[PDB]
Amino acid sequence: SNKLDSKVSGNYNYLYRLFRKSNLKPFERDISTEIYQAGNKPCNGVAGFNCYFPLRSYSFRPTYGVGHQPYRVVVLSFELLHAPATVCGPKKSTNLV
Amino acid sequence: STIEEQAKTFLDKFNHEAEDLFYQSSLASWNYNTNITEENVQNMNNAGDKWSAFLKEQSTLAQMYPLQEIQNLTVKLQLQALQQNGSSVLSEDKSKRLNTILNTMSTIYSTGKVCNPDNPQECLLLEPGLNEIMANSLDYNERLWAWESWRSEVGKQLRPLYEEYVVLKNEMARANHYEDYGDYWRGDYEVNGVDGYDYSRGQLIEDVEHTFEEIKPLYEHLHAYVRAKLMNAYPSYISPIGCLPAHLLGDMWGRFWTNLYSLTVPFGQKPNIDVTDAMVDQAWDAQRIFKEAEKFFVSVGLPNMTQGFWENSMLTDPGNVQKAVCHPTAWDLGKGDFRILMCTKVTMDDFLTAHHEMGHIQYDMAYAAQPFLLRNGANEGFHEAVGEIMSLSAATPKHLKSIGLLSPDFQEDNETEINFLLKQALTIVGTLPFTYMLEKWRWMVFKGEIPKDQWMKKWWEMKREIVGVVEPVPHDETYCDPASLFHVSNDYSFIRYYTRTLYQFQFQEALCQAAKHEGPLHKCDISNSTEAGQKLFNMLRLGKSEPWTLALENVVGAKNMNVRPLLNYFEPLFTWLKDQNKNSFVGWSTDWSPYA
Ligand SMILES: [Zn+2]
């Protein structure tokens, strides 16, 4: 979406997370914004001694290269359970004689 | 918890916001280099202000971070390049008057105007004046007068200022826990921690001096040739046993001898290789020559480039109201933003230079995946070297003939190639004399081995015996020769150009035996050399995570610099110089002076 999502002044809207204490299980949405505690001293909820905000903005600009421009990703996952399986898929038809 | 994790977190952050800040700073820079407007000056200033402020804050807070208990051998480089105590050790007032004294000295250099006698109106800034007089006139009196005026009106003003600045730099170096400021710059080459591949701060002194001594006969024959040409031109002003005049070398500092090429050419009947009229005939522009060089890089297997190159970088002179610099430079705006600045003109020099900065583009691209403080070469001399290797390799007439610049009917001749070799000797070999002179001179000056009252006199002895340059007009301690140089007016290490000159020939030879070239080294091309292209990629893909000694061992297998390629590439030139000088005196005397 380099044509659209890249604005000249900088699309400072969206966020990445880069520091986390541990990994995450598949398929859960975590919205924790607590300051990462890299050092042994407490963060006290503010940036400081080995303490930084885990979320930083994209800061996209049109000048960015192909490998840095925004990309929209959609993941479709199918789940089959003990249900009559409503969503099936299209069925064709032909003229009758 | 251990400190290594804290260091990793901090360095990752530092990379993040540092690359961000550098991105917008370079965006403003590429704004300015194409438009001259005041708010652009303002926002460059304040963006650099945040740059410096946050860098200083991070460096100060990381100064407390030690080095003993941090492993991985690469974070160590990050810490070493991030600590950077520098001049911040001393008091704030000391930094203040250091800043103002550097401002005053740089302004004095820039605002050094030479006014003609008996008319204080037609003053010259050396930008519109002597720069063309030296290259288009051969007047002894005018050159001598301008030389004396430049070394008198300028150096006398800041000779005590130069002494004070040198004392201040040595004092801050001593407070930096180094023996002297020369060692302070030598610390950039400090390499340790890996067995066998270490490098000391005194090894460079020894091997450079030994290599200079080995090369010395080549300079002796070159100086004899130049002196013989000088008697052929001015037999009434140069002694056959004395030293050459200072203002007859080709330039004021003795750096370039190319200005005498048209005077020192033995075979002027045969023109050199110049196909600018050819490309004018096909009406080639910057776009066409750049596509030519693009597929030339393709031929060595190097990949194409993205769109931002050509819908972001503008490659002409804007003229009209938009004012831009015409000094061609490749700008690394950071994080996939690569641009080129050049005013397009029809010239072979512009052709080779354009090859030069686009090779630099690939150079900077090579280490695009490294952490922020690692986006440079293992050393600094690799830069303008790797930039120029491909241009010099393509300078061979075979490459020009293949791509249509040179007609197939043009048979290669020994005279033109010997003329090219002599042009090289006057251009590239001529940089070494002033290089080692100034460089060793500053190493002995900053070591405290030269008395203050006998400084200027101490400048002359080796100048009369090593480089063989005798002053047309005697100079006392009032004069200040180094103050006349621009490259020291901004306080940069001059070793860079010597490293480039000595590394380059080794590089093209390495490429040649990588390409299995057969025959003379001066008839070797890097076209269709994809294996050497990928090997060079492997060489440049490291960055600043390993010693440059390992890079030299990777390219050819040597942990110490080799001067054999320099001799093998000029064996024909050496033989021709010997043949030419076999009927002329060899050597010079250090006692003769033109002023008696
Ligand atoms: Zn270069």
Swiss-Prot record, chain A:
Organism annotation: Severe acute respiratory syndrome coronavirus 2 (2019-nCoV)
Function of the protein: Attaches the virion to the cell membrane by interacting with host receptor, initiating the infection. The major receptor is host ACE2. When S2/S2' has been cleaved, binding to the receptor triggers direct fusion at the cell membrane. When S2/S2' has not been cleaved, binding to the receptor results in internalization of the virus by endocytosis using host TFRC and GRM2 and leading to fusion of the virion membrane with the host endosomal membrane. Alternatively, may use NRP1/NRP2 and integrin as entry receptors.
Location of the region described as Immunodominant HLA epitope recognized by the CD8+ in the Swiss-Prot/TrEMBL record: 11-19
Effect caused by changing residue 19 to L: In strain: Omicron/EG.5.1
SS bonds (residue pairs): 43-51
Part of the intact protein present: 438 to 534 of 1273
Gene name in the database record: S
Protein name: Spike protein S1
Assembly description: Binds to host ACE2. RBD also interacts with the N-linked glycan on 'Asn-90' of ACE2. Cleavage of S generates a polybasic C-terminal sequence on S1 that binds to host Neuropilin-1 (NRP1) and Neuropilin-2 (NRP2) receptors. Interacts with host integrin alpha-5/beta-1 (ITGA5:ITGB1) and with ACE2 in complex with integrin alpha-5/beta-1 (ITGA5:ITGB1). May interact via cytoplasmic c-terminus with M protein. May interact (via N-terminus) with host bilirubin and biliverdin, thereby preventing antibody binding to the SARS-CoV-2 spike NTD via an allosteric mechanism.
Record region (Disordered): 18-53, 82-97
Effect of residue 38 to V: Increased resistance to neutralizing antibodies
Region span, Receptor-binding motif: 1-71
From Swiss-Prot, chain B:
Outcome of substituting residue 371 to D: Increases very slightly the interaction with RBD domain of SARS-CoV-2 spike protein
Effect after changing residue 73 to P: Increases slightly the interaction with RBD domain of SARS-CoV-2 spike protein
Membrane-related topology note: Single-pass type I membrane protein
Effect of residue 61 to T: Increases slightly the interaction with RBD domain of SARS-CoV-2 spike protein
Disulfide bridge partners, by residue number: 115-123, 326-343, 512-524
Principal location class: membrane
Outcome reported for the amino acid change (mutating residue 23 to A): Strongly inhibits interaction with SARS-CoV spike glycoprotein
Extracellular side: 1-596
Reaction it catalyzes: angiotensin II + H2O = angiotensin-(1-7) + L-phenylalanine; angiotensin I + H2O = angiotensin-(1-9) + L-leucine; bradykinin(1-8) + H2O = bradykinin(1-7) + L-phenylalanine; neurotensin + H2O = neurotensin-(1-12) + L-leucine
Residues bearing glycans: 35, 72, 85, 304, 414, 528
Effect on the protein of changing residue 22 to D: Increases slightly the interaction with RBD domain of SARS-CoV-2 spike protein
Residues binding substrate, per UniProt: 255, 327-328, 497
Effect seen on changing residue 1 to P: Increases slightly the interaction with RBD domain of SARS-CoV-2 spike protein
Any one GO molecular function term: metallopeptidase activity
Any GO BP: positive regulation of gap junction assembly
Keywords: Carboxypeptidase, Cell membrane, Cell projection, Chloride, Cytoplasm, Disulfide bond, Glycoprotein, Host cell receptor for virus entry, Host-virus interaction, Hydrolase, Isopeptide bond, Membrane, Metal-binding, Metalloprotease, Phosphoprotein, Protease, Receptor, Secreted, Signal, Transmembrane, Transmembrane helix, Ubl conjugation, Zinc
Active site: 357 (proton acceptor), 487 (proton donor)
Effect of substituting residue 541 to S: Slightly inhibits interaction with SARS-CoV spike glycoprotein
Entry text on domains: The extracellular region of the ACE2 enzyme is composed of two domains. The first is a zinc metallopeptidase domain (residues 19-611). The second domain is located at the C-terminus (residues 612-740) and is 48% identical to human collectrin.
Protein family: Belongs to the peptidase M2 family.
Official protein name in the record: Angiotensin-converting enzyme 2
Part of the whole protein covered: 19 to 614 of 805
